[PDB]
């Protein structure tokens, strides 16, 4: 359970992200795919991209980055009361996209790296710790739905 003070830190940096959703989403997916190449293989849509320059040039990758960050933003702004938003996401990522919880850890590390790069004055250690807690709460709740469905592994 995050405290109100921890949520305020999370949402204050998140408000900065919402000024350039697409730029952040590109940086976060490119970092995920470079750091953890197994993740790129889950996207039939992107598995043709072989270089960071090709990733940066892909408008369809930039579009998906916006989709991802808009869904994450809607979850964060619920401050934990996010059951309605997580249900469908867990369901599609377990049963259709086949994404292991570990890959949600990896994309959480990529988000935190990008926020620190782009927003260092609003992403000191207090805020990094709070964002880490928010993203762990996301993963915990998705993992419980995966387990329900037979995918926690
Ligand atoms: C913060 C974490 C994430 C969020 C909020 C998120 C969000 C979304 C949303 C909103 C969609 C489209 C609606 C749907 O299918 O449910 C989607 C699609 C998808 N996601 Fe995620 N996602 C996340 C992490 C991941 C990770 C880590 C992977 C792979 C490693 C992944 C793989 C996919 C795939 C393969 C699709 C379908 C893309 C396509 O072919 O159109 N997601 N995601």
């Amino acid at each position: 359970v995050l405290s109100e003070g921890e949520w305020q830190l999370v949402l204050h940096v998140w408000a900065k992200v919402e000024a350039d959703v697409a730029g952040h989403g590109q940086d976060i997916l490119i970092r995920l795919f470079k750091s953890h190449p197994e993740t790129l293989e889950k996207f039939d849509r992107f598995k043709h991209l072989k270089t960071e320059a090709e990733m940066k040039a892909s408008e369809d990758l930039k579009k998906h980055g916006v989709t991802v960050l808009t869904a994450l933003g809607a979850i964060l702004k619920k401050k934990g009361h996010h059951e309605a938003e997580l249900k469908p996401l867990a369901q599609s990522h377990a049963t259709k996209h086949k994404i292991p919880i570990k890959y949600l850890e990896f994309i959480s590390e990529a988000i935190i790296h990008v926020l620190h790069s782009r927003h260092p004055g609003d992403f000191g250690a207090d805020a990094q710790g709070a964002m880490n807690k928010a993203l762990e709460l996301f993963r915990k709740d998705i993992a419980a739905k995966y387990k329900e469905l037979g995918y926690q592994g």
Side-chain angles (χ1 to χ4, degrees):
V1 172
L2 278 71
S3 68
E4 279 298 341
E6 287 168 341
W7 285 124
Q8 191 168 26
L9 287 169
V10 169
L11 298 175
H12 182 78
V13 73
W14 200 261
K16 308 300 188 166
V17 169
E18 289 189 332
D20 179 14
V21 179
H24 284 79
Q26 280 175 301
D27 292 350
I28 288 167
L29 294 178
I30 294 180
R31 178 149 195 108
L32 178 64
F33 293 157
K34 291 181 52 136
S35 298
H36 306 276
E38 69 267 47
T39 63
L40 178 63
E41 181 92 339
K42 292 290 177 169
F43 290 88
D44 282 352
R45 212 171 154 179
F46 297 134
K47 71 187 170 87
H48 71 279
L49 295 168
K50 303 303 195 247
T51 73
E52 177 161 11
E54 290 169 1
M55 294 177 192
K56 279 176 177 273
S58 172
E59 191 63 12
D60 199 39
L61 185 52
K62 189 171 176 171
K63 270 179 51 177
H64 205 60
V66 170
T67 292
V68 171
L69 296 189
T70 293
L72 182 59
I75 286 159
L76 294 173
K77 290 174 196 188
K78 293 298 189 172
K79 296 164 66 183
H81 294 104
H82 51 219
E83 163 78 8
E85 288 73 23
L86 255 33
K87 221 187 187 60
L89 179 79
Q91 295 176 346
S92 66
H93 285 65
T95 71
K96 181 176 223 169
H97 312 315
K98 321 292 216 53
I99 303 307
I101 297 302
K102 186 70 179 181
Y103 291 17
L104 301 184
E105 183 188 359
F106 294 157
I107 197 173
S108 295
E109 287 309 307
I111 293 166
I112 287 161
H113 186 274
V114 176
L115 285 176
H116 176 81
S117 294
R118 285 178 164 250
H119 312 291
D122 294 296
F123 206 62
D126 55 350
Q128 287 167 44
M131 184 62 77
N132 185 243
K133 289 195 173 186
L135 296 174
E136 279 207 333
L137 178 60
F138 171 80
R139 290 202 300 288
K140 173 185 173 205
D141 288 349
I142 293 177
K145 295 181 151 146
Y146 273 35
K147 187 171 183 283
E148 175 189 332
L149 296 168
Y151 295 81
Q152 207 206 260

